[PDB]
Amino acid sequence: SSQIRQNYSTDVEAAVNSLVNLYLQASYTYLSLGFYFDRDDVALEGVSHFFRELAEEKREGYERLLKMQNQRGGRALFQDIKKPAEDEWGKTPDAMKAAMALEKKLNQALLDLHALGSARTDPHLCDFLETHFLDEEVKLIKKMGDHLTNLHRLGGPEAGLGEYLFERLTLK
Amino acid sequence: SSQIRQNYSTDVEAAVNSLVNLYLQASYTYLSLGFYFDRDDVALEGVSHFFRELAEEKREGYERLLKMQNQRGGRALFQDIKKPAEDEWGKTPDAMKAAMALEKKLNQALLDLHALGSARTDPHLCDFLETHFLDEEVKLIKKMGDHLTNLHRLGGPEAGLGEYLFERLTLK
Amino acid sequence: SSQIRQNYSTDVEAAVNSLVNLYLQASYTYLSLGFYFDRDDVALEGVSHFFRELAEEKREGYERLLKMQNQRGGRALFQDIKKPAEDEWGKTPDAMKAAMALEKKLNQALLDLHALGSARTDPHLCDFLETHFLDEEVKLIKKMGDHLTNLHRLGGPEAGLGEYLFERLTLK
Amino acid sequence: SSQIRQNYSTDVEAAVNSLVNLYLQASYTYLSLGFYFDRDDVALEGVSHFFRELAEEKREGYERLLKMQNQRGGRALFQDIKKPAEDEWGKTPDAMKAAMALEKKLNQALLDLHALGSARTDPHLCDFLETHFLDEEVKLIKKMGDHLTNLHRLGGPEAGLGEYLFERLTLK
């Protein structure tokens, strides 16, 4: 067993492994979204780049979780990373809704892990999630909601023009 | 009471206190507008930032009035800052109309205070309002009128798309 | 209803609106204190500047609470900002007592909001208040206790000399 | 006589010459104050420097008025500059009261000249006094009122200690 492991329950370790797998699924889903929006028949480089950055941010997320798992004397157990939920993500507001649902699922898994941490009385886990995750998820769910509201006002029969103007003027 | 007070009448002091409360209500209304346009279901960061800059300019406004009232040996009689007129400001043109009505109300209160300054023969008050307020509110009512005309040209069934393009291309 | 809102109860939202109104009342009370100490018959530019900075720090406070209120998909509801507790704040220790009483009240509303966040199991609220507010208040109540202790040793029949030396040598 | 003279009454020209003589009397009174506070039995370097700067500011004042008198095609009629009101200016609060009485007299003569300019309908005079004088005297009467309040705060049996600390900590 680990020599450094202190106040780090098997439940919190397992929920951190579950959350690592969830950030891996999310990073892999944003890989899929990022490369879907760079398809020739989709061609939204700002939407691609947006999800490419989310894939990187969820990767910094699982790498921070694995670094903390190691710092706590937990064992990183790696499961299969599921295939992303869709092969084709539809239009930008369909993909941005899938991204919203995914970050709200990650934020739920963080909040459940924080409820587990505080129930197991693990201050360092709670601090770590608060410092490195819960504010990132809240800020980027807000960013996703801002995008979804803009994509919604850019809806109606002008939808393809609105989708272009979103990608050009919100997403560089 | 005050040793420095010269030519600053009790009704110019009362009208400067009334105008300070009006710039406080205006700052608080622009705070409400600024934070309304940054809601998830509103998501117009340029419109939000525009009204936050107006909250800051109306803050510098009441702080200049209070500074001048201290320089004139008047007493700042602070009063309750009434809540902003709306909880929800609607679409960007209707918020920009509310901002116009507020800024034309402030400009009316400046013009009425300047008329009172001229009637009491207070040159320093008249100069102060001319230097620091009347030109700011004229430039700003012009800027909001320019915004309302652009938001009107961006009206019709292409609203929402025009609202986004106003925020993207005018307010940045 | 707001689409980003997750694990953000109506109680926490209402308590954040109540605390925004309290940080607005506090900022407005420090506006009143700051401009009272710049009156010609008070003339304590360092005590004025001290409360001018507290008004700004309370304004960072309500603006940051409103940023968080929007990031959580809450609604900023704005009430009247009540008139500051006094028209005339007395001598510097009387004002510094009213300021520390205001900051202990505002820190109580933060601790009550954090207890409500803990009871509603809202990690992001708890983190946000810990990060941006609870240490702001503790440092500032300490600073005002340091000021009150200095203003107390500077008391007695020499209180006018002491009030001047406090403003000159503690408050720049 | 003058070819450039337009809309510049003989009353306003004479009242500007009267005001020039008043700024000369004031600059000369501040010369007297400035050198009285450098006197060896008085020895208040900062109080001396304060009135030395006011002698310079009242000199920019009469030079501005004479430049404007020339720009309006008025003739500068130089009357005798009276003896400063006393040679022994007393303690720092007594001298600061004499300086207050003097700037309030100059500010009264500016307000009277501005009322005369308004009654004769001489806009450039009104603007000139508003731009260069009325704000200078209001700021300076405020500064001296702040000084008098601090010197009164520094009064009582400790008056010599208070006078020294005023000079060392306000006027350096």
Short mmCIF file of C-alpha atoms in Angstrom, two decimals, chain D:
data_model
loop_
_atom_site.label_atom_id
_atom_site.label_comp_id
_atom_site.label_asym_id
_atom_site.label_seq_id
_atom_site.Cartn_x
_atom_site.Cartn_y
_atom_site.Cartn_z
CA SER D 1 -9.26 103.77 -29.02
CA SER D 2 -8.41 100.01 -29.44
CA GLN D 3 -9.06 98.37 -32.85
CA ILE D 4 -9.43 94.78 -31.47
CA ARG D 5 -11.88 95.80 -28.72
CA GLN D 6 -15.26 94.18 -29.28
CA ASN D 7 -18.06 93.62 -26.74
CA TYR D 8 -15.82 94.65 -23.82
CA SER D 9 -17.46 97.29 -21.64
CA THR D 10 -15.68 100.13 -19.80
CA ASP D 11 -17.23 98.71 -16.58
CA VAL D 12 -15.71 95.26 -17.24
CA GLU D 13 -12.34 96.82 -18.18
CA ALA D 14 -12.38 98.89 -14.95
CA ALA D 15 -13.55 95.88 -12.88
CA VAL D 16 -10.70 93.79 -14.44
CA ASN D 17 -8.24 96.58 -13.49
CA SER D 18 -9.76 96.59 -9.98
CA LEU D 19 -9.40 92.77 -9.87
CA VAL D 20 -5.78 93.01 -11.14
CA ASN D 21 -5.04 95.44 -8.29
CA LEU D 22 -6.76 92.95 -5.93
CA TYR D 23 -4.61 90.02 -7.21
CA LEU D 24 -1.56 92.31 -6.84
CA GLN D 25 -2.59 93.18 -3.24
CA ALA D 26 -3.20 89.46 -2.63
CA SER D 27 0.09 88.34 -4.23
CA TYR D 28 1.84 91.03 -2.16
CA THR D 29 -0.02 89.90 0.99
CA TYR D 30 1.15 86.35 0.29
CA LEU D 31 4.67 87.71 -0.23
CA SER D 32 4.33 89.26 3.24
CA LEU D 33 2.89 86.05 4.76
CA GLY D 34 5.50 83.87 3.00
CA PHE D 35 8.39 85.92 4.36
CA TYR D 36 6.79 86.29 7.81
CA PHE D 37 6.73 82.47 8.12
CA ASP D 38 10.43 82.32 7.08
CA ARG D 39 11.17 84.86 9.88
CA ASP D 40 13.53 83.43 12.54
CA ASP D 41 11.07 83.86 15.48
CA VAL D 42 8.37 82.15 13.34
CA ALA D 43 10.42 79.47 11.51
CA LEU D 44 7.66 77.54 9.68
CA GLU D 45 9.31 76.53 6.38
CA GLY D 46 6.19 74.71 5.08
CA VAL D 47 3.82 77.59 6.03
CA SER D 48 6.25 80.00 4.36
CA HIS D 49 6.42 77.78 1.26
CA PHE D 50 2.60 77.50 1.25
CA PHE D 51 2.19 81.30 1.12
CA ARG D 52 5.18 81.60 -1.31
CA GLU D 53 3.24 79.34 -3.72
CA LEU D 54 0.08 81.43 -3.16
CA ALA D 55 2.01 84.61 -3.99
CA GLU D 56 3.01 82.84 -7.25
CA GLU D 57 -0.57 81.64 -7.93
CA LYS D 58 -1.97 85.17 -7.35
CA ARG D 59 0.81 86.38 -9.69
CA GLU D 60 -0.25 83.95 -12.42
CA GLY D 61 -3.71 85.38 -11.58
CA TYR D 62 -2.88 89.06 -12.25
CA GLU D 63 -0.70 88.08 -15.25
CA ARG D 64 -3.61 86.03 -16.72
CA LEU D 65 -5.97 88.99 -16.11
CA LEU D 66 -3.53 91.45 -17.72
CA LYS D 67 -3.00 89.10 -20.70
CA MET D 68 -6.80 88.87 -21.11
CA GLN D 69 -7.15 92.68 -20.62
CA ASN D 70 -4.70 93.06 -23.54
CA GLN D 71 -6.43 90.34 -25.64
CA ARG D 72 -9.75 92.24 -25.21
CA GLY D 73 -8.21 95.61 -26.20
CA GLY D 74 -8.64 96.92 -22.64
CA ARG D 75 -5.98 99.17 -21.05
CA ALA D 76 -4.25 97.98 -17.89
CA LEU D 77 -4.61 100.88 -15.39
CA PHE D 78 -2.16 100.12 -12.57
CA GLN D 79 -3.21 101.63 -9.22
CA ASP D 80 -0.93 101.62 -6.12
CA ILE D 81 -0.65 98.16 -4.45
CA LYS D 82 -1.67 98.68 -0.81
CA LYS D 83 0.40 97.76 2.25
CA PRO D 84 -0.50 94.15 3.33
CA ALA D 85 -3.13 94.26 6.10
CA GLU D 86 -0.64 93.66 8.98
CA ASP D 87 3.13 93.00 9.40
CA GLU D 88 2.79 90.55 12.35
CA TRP D 89 0.62 87.74 10.89
CA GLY D 90 0.34 86.00 14.32
CA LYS D 91 0.21 82.19 14.65
CA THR D 92 -0.38 79.86 11.65
CA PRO D 93 -4.21 79.70 12.24
CA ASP D 94 -4.37 83.55 12.40
CA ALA D 95 -2.42 83.84 9.13
CA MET D 96 -4.41 81.02 7.50
CA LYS D 97 -7.62 82.93 8.53
CA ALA D 98 -6.18 86.09 6.91
CA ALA D 99 -5.40 84.02 3.77
CA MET D 100 -8.97 82.62 3.82
CA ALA D 101 -10.40 86.14 4.18
CA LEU D 102 -8.16 87.24 1.28
CA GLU D 103 -9.09 84.38 -1.11
CA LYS D 104 -12.78 84.74 -0.16
CA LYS D 105 -12.40 88.49 -0.99
CA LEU D 106 -10.75 87.62 -4.35
CA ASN D 107 -13.43 85.00 -4.99
CA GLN D 108 -16.07 87.63 -4.16
CA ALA D 109 -14.40 90.05 -6.60
CA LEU D 110 -14.34 87.27 -9.25
CA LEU D 111 -18.02 86.43 -8.64
CA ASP D 112 -18.85 90.18 -8.80
CA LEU D 113 -16.78 90.50 -12.01
CA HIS D 114 -18.52 87.42 -13.47
CA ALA D 115 -21.93 88.89 -12.50
CA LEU D 116 -20.85 92.16 -14.21
CA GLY D 117 -19.65 90.19 -17.29
CA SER D 118 -23.02 88.35 -17.33
CA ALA D 119 -24.98 91.65 -16.99
CA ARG D 120 -22.87 93.38 -19.72
CA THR D 121 -23.13 90.12 -21.77
CA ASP D 122 -19.34 89.54 -22.13
CA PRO D 123 -19.10 85.70 -22.69
CA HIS D 124 -15.31 85.58 -23.13
CA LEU D 125 -14.81 87.25 -19.72
CA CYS D 126 -17.21 84.81 -18.04
CA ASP D 127 -15.44 81.85 -19.72
CA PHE D 128 -12.00 83.25 -18.82
CA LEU D 129 -12.87 83.65 -15.12
CA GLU D 130 -14.59 80.24 -15.04
CA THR D 131 -11.61 78.57 -16.81
CA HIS D 132 -8.73 80.22 -14.95
CA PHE D 133 -9.95 81.75 -11.66
CA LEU D 134 -13.24 80.63 -10.08
CA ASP D 135 -12.12 76.98 -9.92
CA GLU D 136 -8.62 78.00 -8.65
CA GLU D 137 -10.15 80.09 -5.82
CA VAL D 138 -12.77 77.44 -4.92
CA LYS D 139 -10.06 74.71 -4.76
CA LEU D 140 -7.78 77.04 -2.80
CA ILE D 141 -10.45 78.24 -0.32
CA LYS D 142 -11.23 74.49 0.16
CA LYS D 143 -7.49 73.80 0.72
CA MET D 144 -7.28 76.64 3.28
CA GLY D 145 -10.52 75.50 4.96
CA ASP D 146 -8.95 72.04 5.23
CA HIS D 147 -5.86 73.73 6.75
CA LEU D 148 -7.94 75.82 9.19
CA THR D 149 -9.89 72.75 10.31
CA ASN D 150 -6.63 70.86 10.88
CA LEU D 151 -5.06 73.87 12.67
CA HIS D 152 -8.19 74.13 14.90
CA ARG D 153 -8.01 70.34 15.53
CA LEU D 154 -4.33 70.97 16.44
CA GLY D 155 -5.37 73.85 18.82
CA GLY D 156 -5.81 73.90 22.64
CA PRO D 157 -2.85 74.01 25.13
CA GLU D 158 -0.66 71.89 22.74
CA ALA D 159 -0.92 74.75 20.12
CA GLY D 160 2.87 75.03 19.53
CA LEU D 161 3.23 71.24 19.01
CA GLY D 162 0.14 71.32 16.78
CA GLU D 163 1.49 74.25 14.68
CA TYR D 164 4.78 72.36 14.16
CA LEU D 165 3.02 69.10 13.18
CA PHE D 166 0.74 70.98 10.80
CA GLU D 167 3.77 72.52 9.08
CA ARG D 168 5.82 69.25 9.06
CA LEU D 169 3.07 66.81 8.02
CA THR D 170 0.59 68.89 5.93
CA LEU D 171 2.93 71.50 4.34
CA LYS D 172 5.99 69.41 3.26
#
